[PDB]
Design a protein around this ligand. Structure first.
Ligand SMILES: NS(=O)(=O)c1ccc(C(=O)O)cc1
Ligand SMILES: NS(=O)(=O)c1ccc(C(=O)O)cc1
Ligand SMILES: NS(=O)(=O)c1ccc(C(=O)O)cc1
Ligand SMILES: OC[C@H]1O[C@@H](O)[C@H](O)[C@@H](O)[C@@H]1O
Ligand SMILES: [Zn+2]
Length: 257
């Protein structure tokens, strides 16, 4: 099965998912000097006040915090987006050490981790239909660097001991994702893909320029999770990131002058 190891990692995914070599794959390196300010971008609206988190799941590749997306509650609008995109889940990608872990890079810089807030375009009715559309998804990506602790992350950190292995889940109600944002909403945007199989080319990426700081202790707890299921040999869940892919016929636009 696909994963991140030597025998099943990103360099193998194309055999079973040939779109891995496609024309709008993610992540990419963000060359900050070539990215151009785009005055046509409308103000970005991250509206998470009525979010309803439900559950946290170790799916064997990351952990997902899942949300009720049966009505417009936590939504993302504006910026490059046409219409309303509902939050369905967030997850992270992270490294074995602080010097790697992000999927996107900034002038080739790798951050310690990267948060993905995943949203689907309500015009398509359900997530499954949305991933049949070029504009079906919007992922808000936020870099993590190691420094001071992120208080709004601690509830996530503290539940991880209860979902150590693949297939375990736990209640995760009343979690407010606004506590994971940075101060500034300055961003870069480009058209891309899911960064894990099935690698579908459905995503408008919105990558915030300002990282959040998390403490070493917080990210160290991410790295105690397991890729494996209960009773199987322990394989620490680390380095669950795809490297940057070819930019091909794309431009990265900036929201800021
Ligand atoms: N293309 S892939 O889904 O990454 C993949 C890689 C390896 C194996 C395997 O060793 O069994 C199966 C699938
Ligand atoms: N809205 S939900 O049924 O809780 C859900 C959340 C994440 C992935 C699949 C379903
Ligand atoms: N890492 S990511 O590009 O945000 C992502 C989000 C969702 C899915 C999925 O539902 O399969 C895959 C990848
Ligand atoms: O033809 C000029 C145009 O080229 C495009 O590649 C750029 O995205 C635009 O910002 C520019 O105005
Ligand atoms: Zn992701």
């Amino acid at each position: 099965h696909w994963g991140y190891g030597k025998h099943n990692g990103p360099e193998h995914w194309h055999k079973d998912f040939p779109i891995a070599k496609g024309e709008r794959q993610s992540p990419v390196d963000i060359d900050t000097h070539t990215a151009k300010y785009d005055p046509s971008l409308k103000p970005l609206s991250v509206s998470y006040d009525q979010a309803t988190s439900l559950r946290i799941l170790n799916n064997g590749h990351a952990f997902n915090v899942e949300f009720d997306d049966s009505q417009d509650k936590a939504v993302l609008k504006g910026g490059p987006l046409d219409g309303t995109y509902r939050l369905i889940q967030f997850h992270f990608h992270w490294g074995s050490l602080d010097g790697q872990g992000s999927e996107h890079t900034v002038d080739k810089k790798k951050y310690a981790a990267e948060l993905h807030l995943v949203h689907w375009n309500t015009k398509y009715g359900d997530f499954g239909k949305a991933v049949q559309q070029p504009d079906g998804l919007a992922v808000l990506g936020i870099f993590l660097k190691v420094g001071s602790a992120k208080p709004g992350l601690q509830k996530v950190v503290d539940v991880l001991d209860s979902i150590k292995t693949k297939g375990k889940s736990a209640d995760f109600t009343n979690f407010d994702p606004r506590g994971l944002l940075p101060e500034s909403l300055d961003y870069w945007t480009y058209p891309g893909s899911l960064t894990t199989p099935p690698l579908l080319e459905c995503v408008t990426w919105i990558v915030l320029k300002e990282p959040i700081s998390v403490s070493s202790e917080q990210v160290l707890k991410f790295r105690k999770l397991n890729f494996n299921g209960e009773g199987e040999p322990e394989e620490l869940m680390v380095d669950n990131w795809r490297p940057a892919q070819p930019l091909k016929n794309r431009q990265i636009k900036a929201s800021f002058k």
